[PDB]
RNA sequence: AUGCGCGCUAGGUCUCUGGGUCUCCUGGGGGCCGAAGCUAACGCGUUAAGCGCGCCGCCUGGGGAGUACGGCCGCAAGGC
RNA sequence: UAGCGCCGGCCAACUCCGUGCCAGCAGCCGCGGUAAUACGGAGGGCGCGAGCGUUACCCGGAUUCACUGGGCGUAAAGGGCGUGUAGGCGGCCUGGGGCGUCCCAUGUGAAAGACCACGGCUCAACCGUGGGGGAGCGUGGGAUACGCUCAGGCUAGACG
């Protein structure tokens, strides 16, 4: 069966393309603590019907481009902007971590 | 530390340091003597320890110890170098295998002949 | 390459009568009933309190010398016994007792294990009518051990098996002297043997 | 010191304790007074008389 | 801030028992009630009771001790020698049926929060379930 | 009636007016291989006197060990000072797996099958005390059920 | 030479500062002596170095050495 | 055919002769400057034995990177002190979802190796047959105590 993942949309700055942030939880191999991790997927939507903060489902698919191998299955929740804000601030904090 | 501090950073693994760098991960090396000399112990001991300054088939020139009652090592003798540090002399960390290339077995040994390589004496 | 050489010196060093010679070590000649002190120059000097390592080593050496097997074989047997079910001591002793030459000695064809080994090696002993000539052959409970037909007339065999008349063999064995044969009924138990060894020391030795 | 010794030697302890005493170390405690002659007199007299008539 | 209530309750019990107090008070909840119940049957504590302190619901635990001992240090023996918390916030311990621990060769108990309620190791093994490993007591 | 085992003797020194004065300390274990052991520490100007004193103290200070099948009812960890001892029951046919000091203590109590480990400091005196403490802290099923149930 | 927060575990005494039904009782600070306990010991002990939970920082034998090189900061000394 | 290493402690195994801070031994502690059980030889002894020792490298011992299983007042180790971002963690009561979690079934988890039981080489090593185990993933179904999420409340934390 084709893999199905669920995540928020964090970028719609491309044509017929969204960016989905998928969240994962798993015990640490050694310490047994429940670790939480994130990944970004470029999902295909030929109808431009998804925007920022839509918790959507993506499904495995035949390649569309270099980095796009997932399509958007359906919409789950809308207006969930807080997750996008959290992702943005985490990504923004990097300009503080520079050395030069 | 916290389990969080262990997840974030983990534990550093301890790596060993080779006590015999000149060998380059080999049981022995082959070298040529350049200086055959005698030196003095560190402090609580006193003697004249025989020492050979060998150049190896590696890129190393190192001092080695010549064990036994006597030797025959000249200035160009081909020798075999073995691991093992001498406690007294500060800097020598190799031995010479007696009775391989040019170093000969210590004459008239009777007890530990495998070390200080000497053939079994004829009894008749 | 078994141990070949002076024997009663082992009797002396161990300090207990190991019956490794046959008839002599029964007569007042075992060299233990006279001069029971250890061999060598410093035999009859006052002995220091032995360490734990000394105790364990000595017990193991005594047990190993009773059977006259190599250290390698002894260690292998111990590893095999340690890996099975039940008590390690009991199983180990049983496996030590399952050797062909040992069974030959027990049945009484030979006077000593050093003799049983020679009898087996020289093809004088058969198992289930098939000639077996290795001392380390492990006999299973319910095998018939007999003397080869070609080796019946040997005066050694006749003399040895004449002494078995009106003599009791181990309860885990049966003997038919007239037929010159025997049956290995079952594995011997801890109590069935009169070995002067406390195998707990052997176990403790090998654990380290 | 006496109490500690008796504890060490498994000897039962009877004591006329007061407010500043440890109830745990006494096997059989009489919670009363350690001062006031009158109290000591009463308690000891009763105990001794009981011993007397017990014999 | 109070981060772990269950660990707090266990610590309260331990601290009370170490000074031979007859009774302790703990803020009340269903989960703590379940823990106290499991402890109650096994005869560790004398028994728990629901009370109200300034309107706030509390659980009062009556503790149990051995007989008074003889000789030096006459303090009575403990019924709860040792009590720990296994699965803590920031490191949760979940065990299957196969991995359920045995405590003091069956002398002590371990409390599991299984899908079929809060049980002991013995009950869980009988029912053939696992779950969150709360604590071990002996 | 009892067997003695001598764990160690040590010669200690104190400094007088420009001189060394010596004393001897002996650590003696006393047992009957039936579940009764004592441990004694004796100091005297001379070794025999030290050994005698240690024997006396050992006989005066005994503990009962609840054996069954010649092993321990349950595992126990005991820390005395900076030294720690771990004891675990073993099935028959294991033998006594221990260092010199725990071995000597446990054999005289009649233990025939046990697994041990020493952790932290390994001073023989502290290890011996820890071992005795652990032996003093052993409970059986009957004792535990008597406490819990009544 | 004692990171921050929260909860529990005998007390006695001195002191600074609020409240009350003011002999006393109830809060918040600062000090000494000490239950249980902890510690290698000294000692700590409701102002924990006791029993627990959460998060951060740091240690891994001494000397060479806070030295060398690299990077960041500073006018420089120098700092990390 | 019987050799090889050891005999101060660790570590089983002790006397004499020779030398005299020399010659030398050494894995650590250390021996040798006149009666050396530590150097060289002899006699004895111990341990293995067609093998016995040494050098190199790995795991152990090392709880000496401590998840199981360590620590920071003085032994090495609390940041000079705040404010605070990401992260980690989080009171009481009720209901929904079943994400983590637990269970059942099933598909994998090749052979060889490992484990067990039988066998064939005169035994063994070696090999053959059979059975089971197995961390981890996929699919179907189930449970809801705990962690998560979504709703509805509460005042013991926090703030006015
Ligand atoms: Zn004999």
Distance, CA of F112 to CA of F117 (rounded, Å): 16
Helix (H) or strand (E) holding F120: strand F114-120
Please state the domain extents for chain E: 3-80, 81-138
Q: Which of residues 42-81 of E touch strand G (CB under 7 A)?
A: none
Distance, CA of C14 to CA of C24 (rounded, Å): 18
Domains of chain B plus CATH, in order, are 1-124 (2.40.50.140)
- Residues F103, C89: C-beta atoms closer than 8 Å: no
With b meaning 16 or more CB within 10 Å and e meaning fewer, what string describes F67-96?
beebbbbbebebebeebbbebbbbeebbbb
What CA–CA distances, in Å, run from A96 to A38, B2, B8, C30, E54? 21, 26, 20, 93, 51
Helix (H) or strand (E) holding F96: strand F96-97
What CA–CA distances, in Å, run from C36 to C15, C31, C33, C162? 7, 7, 6, 32
- Residues F147, E66: C-beta atoms closer than 8 Å: yes
How many angstroms separate the alpha carbon of residue C11 from the centre of ligand 1?
Answer: 5
* HSE-CB for C147 with a 13 A CA cutoff: 26
Three-class SS of residue E11?
A: helix
Residue C114 belongs to some domain of the structure: yes
Distance, CA of B24 to CA of B1 (rounded, Å): 39
Residue the block writes with tokens 């200080």: B116
For residue F126, give the nucleotide whose C1' atom is nearest its CA: G40
What CA–CA distances, in Å, run from B65 to B93, B110, C123, F22? 8, 22, 57, 45
Q: Strand H nucleotides below 7 A of a protein CB?
A: 1-6, 10-15, 21-33, 40-50, 52-59, 63-67, 70-72, 85-94, 99-104, 115-117, 122-123, 138-139, 142-147, 156-157
- Residues E71, D10: C-beta atoms closer than 8 Å: yes
Distance, CA of F29 to CA of F57 (rounded, Å): 10
CATH class belonging to F3-63: alpha beta
CA atom of B18 to C1′ atom of H56, Å: 10
What CA–CA distances, in Å, run from B119 to B81, B82, B104, B124, C174? 20, 20, 11, 15, 56
Tell whether C30 is in a known binding site.
Answer: yes
CATH of domain F64-149: 3.30.230.10
- Method of elucidation: cryo-EM
CA atom of F80 to C1′ atom of H88, Å: 36
- Do C102 and C179 fall into the same domain? yes
CA atom of E81 to C1′ atom of G77, Å: 63
- Alpha-helical regions (H) of A52-94: 82-92
Q: Strands (DSSP E) along chain E, which ranges?
A: 23-27, 47-53, 56-62, 83-85, 94-95, 109-114, 117-120, 131-137
With b meaning 16 or more CB within 10 Å and e meaning fewer, what string describes B28-55?
ebebbbeebeebeeeeeeeeebbbbbbe
E residues 53-82 near D, CB within 8 Å?
70-72, 74-75
Residue C2 belongs to some domain of the structure: no
Residue C194 main-chain phi, psi, to 5 deg: -110, 30
CB atoms within 10 A of CB E39: 22
- In terms of residues, how long is chain E? 138
Please state the domain extents for chain A: 1-100
Domain coverage including residue C116 = 97-184
Is E43 in CB contact (< 8 Å) with chain F? yes
* Planar angle of CA D28, D33, D39, nearest 5 degrees: 105
Is B4 in CB contact (< 8 Å) with chain A? yes
Map chain D to HEC letters.
CHHHHHHHCCCCCEECCCCCCCCCCCCEECCCCCCCHHHHHHHHHHHHHHHHHHC
What burial class does residue D15 get, using C-beta atoms within 10 Å of its C-beta: 0-12 exposed, 13-18 middle, 19+ buried?
Answer: buried
Residue the block writes with tokens 């099948």: F69
Three-class SS of residue A59?
A: strand
Note the resolution in Å, 1 decimal: 3.3
- Residues C203, F92: C-beta atoms closer than 8 Å: no
- Residues A31, E91: C-beta atoms closer than 8 Å: yes
Number of domains in chain C: 2
Kindly give, in sequence order, each residue whose CB lies less than 8 Å from that of residue C107, ignoring residues fewer than 6 positions away. C145, C169, C173, C175, C182
CATH number for the domain that contains residue C69: 1.10.1050.10
What CA–CA distances, in Å, run from B5 to A20, B48, C146, F25? 29, 57, 74, 48
Q: Are F72 and F131 in contact (CB under 8 A)?
A: no
Q: E93 contacts in A (CB within 8 Å)?
A: 32
Going by C-alpha positions, the residue among C49, C43, C33, C54 that lies closest to residue C13 is C43
Distance, CA of E80 to CA of F139 (rounded, Å): 13
CB atoms within 10 A of CB C149: 10
Q: What is the DSSP letter of C84?
A: S
């Amino acid at each position: 069966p084709k893999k199905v993942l669920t995540g928020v949309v964090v970028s719609d700055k491309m044509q017929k393309t969204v960016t989905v942030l998928v969240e994962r939880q798993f015990p640490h191999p050694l310490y047994g603590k429940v670790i939480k991790r994130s990944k970004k997927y470029l999902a295909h939507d030929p109808e431009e019907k998804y925007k920022l903060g839509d918790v959507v489902e993506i499904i495995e698919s035949r390649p569309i481009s270099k980095r796009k191998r997932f399509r958007v299955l359906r919409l789950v929740e809308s207006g969930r902007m807080d997750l996008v804000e959290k992702y943005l601030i985490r990504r923004q904090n990097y300009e503080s971590l520079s050395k030069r | 530390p916290t389990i969080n501090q262990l997840v974030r950073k983990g534990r550093e693994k301890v790596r060993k340091k080779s006590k015999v760098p000149a060998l380059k991960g080999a049981p022995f090396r082959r070298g040529v003597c350049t200086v055959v000399r005698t030196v003095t112990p560190k402090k609580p001991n006193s003697a004249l320890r025989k020492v050979a300054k060998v150049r190896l088939t590696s890129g190393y020139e190192v001092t080695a110890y010549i064990p036994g009652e006597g030797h025959n090592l000249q200035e160009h003798s081909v020798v075999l170098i073995r691991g093992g540090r001498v406690k007294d002399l500060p800097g020598v960390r190799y031995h010479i295998v007696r009775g391989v290339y040019d170093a000969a077995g210590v004459k008239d040994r009777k007890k530990s002949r495998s070390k200080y390589g000497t053939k079994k004496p004829k009894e008749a | 390459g078994r141990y070949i050489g002076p024997v009663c010196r082992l009797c002396r060093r161990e300090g207990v009568k190991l019956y490794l010679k046959g008839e002599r070590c029964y007569s007042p000649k075992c060299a233990m009933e006279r001069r029971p002190y250890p061999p060598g120059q410093h035999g009859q000097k006052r002995a220091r309190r032995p360490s734990d390592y000394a105790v364990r080593l000595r017990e193991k050496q005594k047990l190993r010398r009773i059977y006259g097997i190599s250290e390698r074989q002894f260690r292998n047997l111990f590893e095999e016994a340690s890996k099975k079910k039940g008590v390690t001591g009991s199983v180990f002793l049983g496996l030590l007792e399952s050797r062909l030459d040992n069974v030959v000695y027990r049945l009484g064809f030979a006077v000593s294990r050093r003799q049983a080994r020679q009898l087996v090696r020289h093809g004088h002993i058969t198992v289930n009518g098939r000639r077996v000539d290795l001392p380390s052959y492990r006999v299973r409970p319910g095998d018939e051990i007999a003397v080869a037909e070609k080796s019946r007339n040997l005066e050694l065999i006749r003399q040895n098996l004449e002494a078995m008349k009106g003599r009791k063999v181990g309860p885990w064995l049966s003997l038919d002297v007239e037929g010159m044969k025997g049956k290995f009924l079952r594995l011997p138990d801890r109590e069935d043997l009169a070995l002067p060894v406390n195998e707990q020391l052997v176990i403790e030795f090998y654990s380290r | 010191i006496a109490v500690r010794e008796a504890r060490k030697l498994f000897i039962p302890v009877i004591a006329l304790a007061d407010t500043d005493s440890d109830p745990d170390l006494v096997d059989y405690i009489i919670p009363g007074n350690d001062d006031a002659i009158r109290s000591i007199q009463l308690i000891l007299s009763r105990a001794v008389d009981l011993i007397i008539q017990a014999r | 801030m109070l981060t772990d209530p269950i660990a707090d309750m266990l610590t309260r019990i331990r601290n009370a028992t170490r000074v031979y107090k007859e009774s302790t008070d703990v803020p009340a909840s269903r989960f703590k009630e379940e823990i106290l119940r499991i402890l109650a049957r096994e005869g560790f504590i004398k028994g728990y009771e629901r009370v109200d302190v300034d309107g706030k619901p509390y659980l009062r635990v009556y503790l149990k001790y051995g007989p008074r001992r003889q000789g030096p240090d006459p303090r009575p023996e403990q019924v709860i020698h040792h009590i720990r918390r296994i699965s803590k916030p920031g490191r949760r311990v979940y065990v299957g049926v196969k991995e359920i621990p045995r405590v003091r060769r069956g002398l002590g108990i371990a409390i599991l929060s299984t899908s079929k309620g809060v049980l002991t190791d013995r009950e869980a093994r009988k029912l053939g379930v696992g779950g969150e490993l709360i604590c071990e007591v002996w | 009636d009892f067997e003695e085992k001598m764990i160690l003797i040590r010669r200690t020194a104190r400094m007088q007016a420009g001189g060394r004065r010596f004393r001897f300390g002996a650590l003696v274990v006393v047992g009957d291989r039936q579940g009764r052991v004592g441990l004694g520490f004796g100091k005297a100007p001379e070794v025999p006197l030290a050994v005698q004193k240690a024997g006396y103290y050992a006989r005066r200070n005994m503990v009962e060990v609840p054996l069954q099948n010649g092993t321990i009812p349950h595992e126990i960890e005991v820390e005395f000072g900076a030294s720690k001892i771990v004891l675990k029951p073993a099935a028959p046919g294991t033998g006594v797996i221990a260092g010199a000091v725990p071995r000597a203590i446990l054999e005289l109590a009649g233990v025939t099958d046990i697994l041990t480990k020493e952790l932290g400091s390994r001073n023989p005196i502290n290890i011996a005390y820890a071992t005795m403490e652990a032996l003093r802290q052993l409970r059986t099923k009957a004792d535990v059920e008597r406490l819990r149930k009544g």
